[PDB]
Structure formats: C-alpha cells, structure tokens
Amino acid sequence: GRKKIQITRIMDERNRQVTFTKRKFGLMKKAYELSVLADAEIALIIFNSSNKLFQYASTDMDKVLLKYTEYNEP
Amino acid sequence: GRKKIQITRIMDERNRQVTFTKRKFGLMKKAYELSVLADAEIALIIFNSSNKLFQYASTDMDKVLLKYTEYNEP
DNA sequence: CTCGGCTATTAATAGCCGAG
DNA sequence: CTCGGCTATTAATAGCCGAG
C-alpha cells in the first residue's frame, strides 16, 4: 500500500526478503479468512528459505494426499 | 471493497457463492503474484462445490508429495 | 424467483527513519 | 553496513441494477 508495486522480484536482497515475510504470514492469513467465508477445501504449504514449514487446511489435508493422488492417476 | 466485510459465512446462499468465486480466482491470482515477487515454494489446491480442480505450484508440487510426506513421517 | 455484467471502497501489503 | 518497529496507500474484493 505505501506504494504501487510491480509483479517482479525485488533486486534489493534486504527488501526482497521483507516483501515475502509480509505475504508469507499475510497469505496464510487468507487461507483462514477465505476458509471462514465459504469453508472451502484449500491446501496451503510454504517453505520459507529461513527454514519454516507451515501447513493450513480447512478440509483436513489428509484427503489432499489421497485425493490429489487420484487426479495424478491416469 | 464496496463495503467492509466481516469474516463470517454469508447466510445468503446466492451471495455466499458469489464471494467464494471472487476469492477462488482472486486467490490463485496471489499464488502467481506472490510467486513472482519471491519465487517461493507454495502449494495451492482448491475444490469448488461447482466441481473445479485447480493446482498451482511455483516449486513443482512433485516435491510437495514426497516432501510433505517427510514432515508427516515421525 | 433468479442471474449476470460492470464498478467503488477498505484491508493488508510495502515501505521508511533512527541507532549501534 | 545492517536491522527492526510502526504506519499510509492501491489493488482486489463484494457488491448492486435491470431483464425475462
């Protein structure tokens, strides 16, 4: 918001990591907000380079493993 | 934007489906925008009650299957 | 009884200054 | 040479009117 952003990686390594940290926690926030508004089935996984695994799923990812595996099947 | 929204399911079945369609395509839009700004590892899966499967992954979900399976391992 | 097409406004995002 | 804490503004979201 403080400025109009362009969809491009920030050459500033210091700022580049700053925009991702904002969206990282800022995105998972949406998986929760979008889930409460429609309680839809979603699967969000992130692997920040700072070593941080986060898994959020309003429909129990237990299915995503078998279910997604079914779409991957011919 | 046309109004301040509250994090709650819309009792209006007609509008309830409307907010989800906006976020559904509107969210996957972010997996692409957040991916271009930091090219991070993300896994987005959605199952709309209207029967529509969408899979987006900037880090090839091929790993999410084995990688996520490693965190699920004791 | 219902729906789509086109549009306005708030939150969340990206940022900047001071100190060591 | 580097970082964090606290804050302002634009896009994307949620919506509303007319017609059958």
Side-chain angles (χ1 to χ4, degrees):
Chain A
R2 280 282 198 161
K3 53 91 84 302
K4 185 156 65 81
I5 65 175
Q6 186 151 19
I7 312 310
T8 188
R9 180 180 287 165
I10 320 190
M11 295 195 110
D12 291 349
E13 191 180 1
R14 177 179 197 316
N15 194 11
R16 181 203 112 170
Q17 163 153 49
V18 174
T19 170
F20 181 73
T21 314
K22 301 280 88 127
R23 311 266 300 168
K24 202 217 329 102
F25 190 77
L27 188 78
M28 34 229 276
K29 174 183 164 49
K30 280 78 189 319
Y32 182 88
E33 293 194 353
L34 170 58
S35 174
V36 169
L37 299 179
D39 187 8
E41 316 313 61
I42 306 169
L44 176 75
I45 313 185
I46 311 199
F47 305 72
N48 192 343
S49 62
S50 296
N51 197 322
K52 185 236 299 237
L53 190 80
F54 202 109
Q55 187 209 355
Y56 184 90
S58 64
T59 183
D60 190 3
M61 181 178 270
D62 187 5
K63 80 187 210 197
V64 160
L65 315 183
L66 185 70
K67 198 93 285 203
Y68 178 87
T69 304
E70 292 203 348
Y71 282 107
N72 197 5
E73 233 167 5
Chain B
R2 280 283 198 162
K3 53 91 84 302
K4 185 156 66 82
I5 66 175
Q6 183 166 48
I7 312 310
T8 188
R9 181 180 286 165
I10 320 190
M11 293 193 114
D12 291 349
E13 191 180 1
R14 178 179 197 315
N15 195 10
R16 182 202 110 168
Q17 163 153 50
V18 174
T19 170
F20 181 73
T21 315
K22 301 280 88 127
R23 312 265 301 168
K24 202 218 328 103
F25 190 77
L27 187 79
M28 35 229 275
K29 174 183 165 49
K30 279 78 189 319
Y32 182 88
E33 293 195 353
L34 170 58
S35 174
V36 169
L37 299 179
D39 188 8
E41 316 313 61
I42 306 169
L44 176 75
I45 313 185
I46 311 198
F47 307 69
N48 192 344
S49 62
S50 296
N51 197 322
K52 185 237 299 237
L53 190 80
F54 202 109
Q55 187 209 355
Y56 184 90
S58 64
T59 184
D60 190 3
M61 181 178 270
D62 187 5
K63 80 187 210 197
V64 160
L65 315 183
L66 184 70
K67 198 94 285 203
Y68 178 87
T69 304
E70 292 203 348
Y71 282 107
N72 196 5
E73 233 167 5

